[PDB]
């Protein structure tokens, strides 16, 4: 909770406890500090706990897991009581930048699942030689929580039944809209949510006072909330340390006021824009840490790296006469200005970090590091600039991801270690170039570039062969084991996984010979799919949807935002939707998931406003 414990301690008022009912009637006024209009769920954060909880005993079968997810959504919903919109965002295929970090995670997990059972087998055999009896394939692979797998496809169907059941049977759902963004819609859940808010904000019908609440534990969600620029934005998450399950709201509006005082500067050379200084603060946070680059060795959140950048940033400001970023594009001469400044103090940070192999704290540290981690030395500083320039390109990509939507589905940082701030000289001459057109991978291709061979069940049978047999021309992409560099850090999960980068071109080349063996179901999982929006029979836009649903036509119809509190977009007929008035048989075999005798919810395809 590195970033949170920092934020919570520094700005304690941004945290407010949730009141919760411990038979709940959600139509009643919300007992929390305010009422909420929109609830966004980053689904991946609910699925992982509900399918392989590491603290409880795991659920028996998939039906029990789907029921828990239903129960958990019900729980968040009854707390937040969104009066307008409920948005459920599942991870689709991610940009390349994320895929390398997703690959590292699935490869690492399969290693642990194997080390789990190697120790289980070690305990058993230890007991059997001591003199204690012991008890005697049907395990859950957390990697199956990835776009393209059978499981993800089955979760999407359970969520459809869920949405119809609650919108028909739950009285509080009677007048809300529900959007579902499943794993065939490319993009991480959080960025789908980010983009939904952004495209709404950009339409005149949008209610600028909608009360937003986003559910998820990632720290990025704090910056997402700032970058939406939405007035009343909030996060709900579980308490970090608690005796029972307790939820708290992070109140972005409160953080704004705190940051508004933190980031005020006297004698500014160009007009003070509070909205634009927050944007620079967001960029500075991603500088210290983000999903797509390794963290510079001189910036650790526990060492007050954010406080340090602010002081450094405030200093820059009285020098180049403008803000650090404009609309998501960092000014690279100003980046270099902060990097030269952080570089003058890198040596002190290491020596200060020392009082607590590679010797960052004693002289000559930079050259050992570039020899140790990259195997280059002193002579080659063209290389040091090459990683540094590759690194700033990354930061451009990140800030652009949040503020304007993905800039490149193909870009990635091609190194296992980060440079030092002193290497970012000359970075000002770099000009980022994200104009090459890129499209996301197909789900199965990303499986191939993100799975280890241990998770080959989830692939078409002819594709599994490509992951394991020695004659396979991509067998090199699926090592049985790999070494993890601890990198000074304590635990193996803080270290670097030394896995080969995927040869995108050679992968797609190999897959050409096996693409025609896909089944219909496999071809289906491998298709870019749409978003869906649901309303109940009482919703004031129900008849509107019903016309579009009955048209059986594929033209995208612009919504009447008057019937939706300003939600804009386009909808169209969903041939797979279950119509109002028909039964909806439950795909989840559980006491809590009864068949629906008559579905009263209508489901159409949804498209964010262009």
């Amino acid at each position: 909770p590195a970033f949170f414990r920092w934020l919570t301690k520094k700005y304690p008022a941004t945290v407010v406890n949730a009141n919760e009912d411990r038979p709940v009637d959600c139509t009643q006024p919300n007992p929390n500090f305010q009422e909420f209009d929109n609830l966004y769920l980053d689904m991946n954060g609910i699925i992982h706990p509900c399918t392989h909880p590491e603290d409880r005993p795991a659920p028996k079968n998939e039906d029990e897991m789907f029921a828990l997810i239903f129960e958990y959504i019900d729980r968040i919903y009854s707390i937040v009581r969104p009066r307008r919109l409920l948005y459920m965002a599942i991870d689709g295929v991610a940009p390349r930048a994320k895929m390398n970090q997703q690959r590292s995670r699935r490869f690492r997990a399969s290693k642990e699942m194997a080390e789990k059972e190697a120790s289980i087998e070690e305990q058993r055999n230890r007991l059997m030689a001591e003199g204690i009896a012991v008890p005697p394939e049907a395990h859950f692979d957390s990697n199956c929580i990835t776009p393209g797998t059978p499981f993800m496809a089955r979760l999407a169907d359970a969520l459809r039944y869920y949405i119809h059941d609650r919108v028909t049977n739950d009285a509080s759902w009677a007048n809300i809209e529900i959007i579902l963004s499943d794993a065939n819609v490319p993009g991480e859940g959080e960025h789908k949510i980010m983009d939904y808010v952004r495209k709404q904000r950009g339409n005149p019908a949008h209610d600028p006072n909608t009360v937003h609440c986003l559910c998820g534990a990632d720290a990025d969600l704090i910056m997402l909330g700032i970058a939406t620029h939405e007035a009343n934005f909030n996060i709900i998450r579980e308490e970090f340390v608690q005796r029972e399950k307790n939820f708290i709201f992070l109140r972005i509006p409160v953080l704004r006021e705190y940051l508004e005082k933190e980031l005020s500067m006297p004698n500014l050379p160009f007009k003070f824009d509070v909205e634009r200084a927050l944007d620079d603060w967001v960029f500075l946070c991603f500088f210290v840490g983000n999903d797509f680059l390794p963290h510079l060795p001189s910036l650790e959140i526990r060492e007050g790296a954010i406080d340090r950048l602010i002081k450094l940033y405030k200093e820059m400001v009285y020098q180049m006469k403008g803000y650090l970023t404009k609309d998501g594009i960092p000014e690279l001469d100003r980046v270099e200005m902060i990097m030269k400044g952080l570089g003058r103090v890198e040596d002190e940070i290491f020596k200060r970090r020392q009082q607590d192999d590679i010797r960052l704290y004693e002289s000559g540290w930079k050259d050992r590091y570039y020899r140790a981690k990259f195997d280059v030395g002193s002579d080659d500083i063209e290389f040091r600039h090459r990683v540094a320039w590759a690194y700033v390109e990354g930061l451009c990509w990140v800030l652009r991801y949040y503020y304007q939507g993905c800039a490149s589905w193909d870009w990635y940082f091609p190194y296992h270690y980060a440079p030092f701030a002193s290497d970012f000289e000359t970075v000002g001459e770099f000009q980022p170039d994200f104009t090459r057109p890129t499209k996301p991978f197909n789900p199965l291709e990303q499986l191939m570039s993100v799975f280890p061979a241990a998770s080959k069940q989830h692939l078409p049978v002819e594709w599994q062969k490509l992951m394991i047999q020695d004659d396979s021309p991509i067998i090199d992409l699926y090592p049985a084991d790999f070494r993890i560099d601890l990198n000074g850090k304590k635990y193996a999960w803080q270290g670097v996984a030394l896995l080969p980068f995927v040869d995108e071109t050679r992968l797609l080349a190999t897959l050409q010979s096996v693409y025609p063996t896909l089944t219909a179901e496999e071809k289906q999982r491998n298709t870019r799919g749409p978003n869906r929006i649901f309303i109940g029979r009482n919703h004031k836009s129900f008849e509107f949807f019903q016309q579009v649903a009955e048209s059986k036509s594929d033209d995208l119809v612009p919504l009447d935002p008057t019937l939706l509190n300003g939600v804009s977009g386009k909808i169209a007929y969903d041939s797979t939707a279950t119509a109002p008035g028909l039964p909806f048989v439950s795909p989840v075999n559980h006491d809590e998931c009864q068949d629906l005798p008559t579905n009263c919810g209508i489901c159409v395809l949804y498209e964010d406003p262009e």
């Binding site: 990259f374 091609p414 021309p473 090592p479 049985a480 896995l499 050679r506 080349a509």
Partner: protein, 73 residues
């Protein structure tokens, strides 16, 4: 075209200069024995084992030991 220019086009800009020479020499030692894509695979397999420390099948290790033998001469 040529065998030297073919191998040189396999370099990736992020590849260290020392790490490229090891890949270059493996591709050059076996160029005339495997089609383009298989050399790529085998060459990457070689430097994944010697440089990154990855482990592969019992069988592939004995193949990459043999192929890799001597490519620090």
């Amino acid at each position: 075209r040529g065998k030297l220019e073919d191998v040189e086009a396999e370099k990736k800009l992020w590849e260290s200069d020392d790490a490229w020479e090891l890949r270059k020499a493996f591709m050059l030692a076996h160029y005339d024995d495997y089609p383009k894509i298989q050399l790529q695979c085998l060459s990457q397999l070689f430097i994944n084992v010697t440089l990154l420390g990855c482990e592969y099948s019992q069988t592939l290790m004995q193949k990459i030991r043999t192929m890799g033998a001597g490519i620090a001469a």
